[PDB]
From a paper:
Nitrile hydratase (NHase, EC 4.2.1.84), comprising α- and β-subunits, is a metalloenzyme that catalyzes nitriles into amides. The NHase active site contains either a non-heme iron or non-corrin cobalt, buried in a deep internal pocket, similar to most enzymes in nature. Hence nitrile substrates should pass through a tunnel to access the active site, and rational tunnel engineering might be a plausible choice for NHase substrate scope modification. We rationally refined the tunnel entrance region of NHase from Pseudonocardia thermophila JCM 3095 (PtNHase), based on substrate access tunnel calculations.
Two successful mutants, PtNHase-βM46R and PtNHase-βA129R, which exhibited high catalytic activity toward bulky substrates were obtained. To understand the mechanism underlying the expanded substrate scope with bulky amino acid substituents, the crystal structures of PtNHase-βM46R and PtNHase-βA129R were obtained and analyzed. Both structures had clear electron density at the mutated sites. The βArg46 and βArg129 residues were located at the “upper entrance loop” and “lower entrance loop” of the substrate access tunnel, respectively. The hydrophobic side chain of βMet46 in WT was buried and oriented towards the interior of the protein, whereas the bulky side chain of βArg46 in PtNHase-βM46R formed a hydrogen bond with a water molecule, showing an obvious outward offset to the solvent. Compared with the WT, an additional potential tunnel that started from the active site and ended at the surface entrance of the PtNHase-βM46R mutant was observed, which might provide more alternatives for bulky substrate migration. Introducing β46R and β129R mutations into PtNHase resulted in an 8.2-fold and 4.2-fold increase in activity toward pentanenitrile, and a 6.2-fold and 8.3-fold increase in activity toward cinnamonitrile, respectively. The residual activities of the WT and PtNHase-βM46R were 64.3% and 62.0%, respectively, indicating that the mutation at the βMet46 site did not significantly affect its thermostability. The maximum entrance sizes of WT, PtNHase-βM46R, and PtNHase-βA129R were estimated to be 39 Å2, 47 Å2, and 46 Å2, respectively.
Author numbering:
A (entry chain B), C (entry chain B): 1 to 42, 46 to 228
B (entry chain A), D (entry chain A): 2 to 204
The structure:
């Protein structure tokens, strides 16, 4: 989708706000939002992204980062009917008014801990084996598609229709244009492509700079080997 | 930036806290969240996984040229030689700072970061100011925000992680550190030096 | 500039909010903001646009429209030093606390009324005569530049690098890439160009639709006459 | 749309009012604004200039084929024949709805509108929802927001006013109005019919 979230090359967002140091978690609520990433895929990572991309943009641009995770979880909850939105509003107000009230009693679950340690140190690899060989190879000159899907994809507006040089083939991976739209993994070959600053921005680009952007095979077509 | 429509930070914090506790109470009743699962996750990236891990990889590649070659061929496999890997670093490609080339890393679409070597990213990395400007004015961004003058002849390569492949910068070894110990050299490797927004510490 | 204000083809901004009827002015403050357009060019219209484009985007996307005009006026005021920003903050708080307090005593000015009636019914034409003839003509097939100036321009991201057909030559007009950046009128020939939906959006575009977009001569280069 | 960071409308209105009165008091002391200049502008676009003016142009082109041809050749000159013109309508190009072609008008970059024939635009025209979607999903936008089904064979032409040229839609004359008076036909021309988001009124 052509969301404002796709901010690469956007002008006028202002200076960077960088404190000299900060903690990993700035508030206890951020730990709760974080723990919801692993609780989500236990919908995959791609669908998790798509729900952030459909946020209110003004909300997206200025909220604390982990609020994006709360939004994407509620987005999928109400859609799959697993989160009743009206109960959630009542609970919000309840905790607005009684912020120190306890959480609901629950059993701790050992398997959720083993899952956590497993995902963290073992990983959740997105690489997949496919039946077709790669179409492209190092040094091929390719053109990034000007398509503009309405659902989830990884086609930053600032590379669409630009021409780059294939730099590395990585194997095949989960394809976002199907995965993040609930249409399955449909694995595709993955490539790093190099775009000069001047191809990307015109004369306004730095004369000695390039951007490397990962492209899935359907994203690119041959111009020259 | 000034936005006359925006609530106070305190009011924003108070509203988020209530909405989060409310969602949490519902997920707990569904059985998919527990307080212990939350604390374990928080514990891991507060104390266990962090940029100290990536510094070990850097000092090994600095002091072991065969390892460095494997690091640059396949970052996941080489970091595994040090028992370092996992979530959001399943595919790692490390890239080398030279006298001719400087590397800087960004996720313009969201916030992708190599968690197993760096931990969770600082907030400025996940926010729109850095993400929007670095692919378009890398040289000035580095000067203005980080005090880092990259000479206009040096090529700046910006790596945008639009896939699960994660890019990590191997910073140049500082001058004046010949024969230093691995623990000594580690004090020079910063989180920022492996994002590429700063060099490793001087002296 | 690549501002979020350039919203053509952006996804996810939500349904249209349209009341069945509304008044021209929803509040007395909106009349004051409006009257400031004619008080501004008495800096031109192009510079007036550029200052809106540099607003905070989250503020831009959700504020009442005429707040954009207040912002662009303050932007130019402080830059030209004509508006002391600290006095303005003090006055804001003063009127926050005493909203019914009078305005400063002033003389009414007859010439400001004659100026108003003149601009409204006589117009403020942007057409200019130039010395060079037009480069392009009806039916020429042209390609919109992929340049991306950091200052003001009229290069909506969704047409950059697209190919269209010149539909009408209008004569020459004020050129925004100089005018809105304080670099003068530098008049340029103006053309309407036609882009198919499919050229603009790919397969996601309506199969029977086209977009007409006005291009100044430097914006376009020949592909085919 | 819901934005948890946003103040209440009432709080936004109260803050804007104070900031505007403050700026106004400074412009008045500079002598570039007066209360009388403000009231004259407000008066003009509240009572004098409005879509009733554009309706006269439409009914004339409907009932006078030579005028219609001049309207479509040069909109500014033809509207001048009716003493209609001026600010933000110095360059007007009118475009004709047919059985084969439907026209809709938009300013994606800001809010450009033909003030001398339409007056100031409604707020939905100047807001990002309409501006962002109409160049990309014109057919559905017209169905969903305006109840206007444009058959998929009919071509939708969208005119984005990126220059001072202003585009105005000449709507098709409704069926069942043969020989009606100019004042009668005017009751059918809406502001929306000259933006292209609706047809002229039926019956
Ligand atoms: Co990311
Ligand atoms: Co406009």
């Amino acid at each position: 989708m052509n969301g404002v979230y796709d901010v690469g090359g956007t002008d006028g967002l202002g200076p960077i706000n960088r404190p000299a140091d900060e903690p990993v978690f700035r508030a206890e609520w951020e730990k709760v939002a974080f723990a919801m990433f692993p609780a989500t895929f236990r919908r995959g990572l791609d669908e998790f992204r798509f729900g952030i991309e459909q946020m209110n943009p003004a909300e997206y641009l200025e909220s604390p980062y982990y609020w994006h995770w709360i939004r994407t979880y509620i987005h999928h909850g109400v859609r799959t009917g697993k989160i009743d939105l009206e109960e959630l509003e009542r609970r919000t107000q309840y905790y607005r008014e009684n912020p120190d009230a306890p959480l609901p009693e629950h059993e701790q679950k050992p398997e959720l801990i083993e899952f956590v340690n497993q995902a963290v140190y073992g990983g959740l690899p997105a690489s997949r084996e496919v039946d077709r060989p790669p179409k492209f190879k190092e040094g091929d000159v390719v053109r990034f598609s000007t398509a503009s899907p309405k659902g989830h994809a990884r086609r930053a507006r600032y590379v669409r229709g630009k021409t780059g040089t294939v730099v590395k083939h990585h194997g095949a991976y989960i394809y976002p244009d199907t995965a993040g739209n609930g249409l399955g993994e449909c694995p595709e070959h993955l490539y790093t492509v190099r775009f000069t600053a001047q191809e990307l921005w015109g004369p306004e680009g730095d004369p000695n700079s390039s951007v490397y952007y990962d492209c899935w095979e359907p994203y690119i077509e041959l111009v020259d080997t | 930036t000034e936005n006359i429509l925006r609530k106070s930070d305190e009011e924003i914090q108070k509203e988020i806290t209530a909405r989060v506790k409310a969602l949490e109470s519902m997920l707990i009743e569904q059985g998919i969240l527990t307080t212990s699962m939350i604390d374990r996750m928080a514990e891991i990236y507060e104390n266990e996984v962090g940029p100290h891990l990536g510094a070990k990889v850097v000092v090994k590649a600095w002091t072991d040229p065969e390892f460095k070659k494997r690091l640059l061929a396949d970052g996941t496999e080489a970091c595994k030689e040090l028992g370092i890997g996992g979530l959001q670093g399943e595919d790692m490609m490390w890239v080398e700072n030279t006298d001719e080339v400087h590397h800087v890393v960004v996720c313009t679409l969201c916030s992708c970061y190599p968690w197993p070597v760096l931990g969770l990213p600082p907030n400025w990395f996940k926010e729109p100011q850095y993400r929007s400007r670095v692919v378009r004015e890398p040289r000035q961004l580095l000067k203005e925000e980080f005090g880092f003058e990259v000479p206009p002849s040096k090529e700046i390569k910006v790596w945008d992680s639009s896939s699960e492949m994660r890019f990590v910068v191997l910073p140049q070894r500082p001058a004046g550190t010949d024969g230093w110990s691995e623990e000594e050299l580690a004090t020079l490797v910063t989180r920022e030096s492996m994002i590429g927004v700063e060099p490793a510490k001087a002296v």
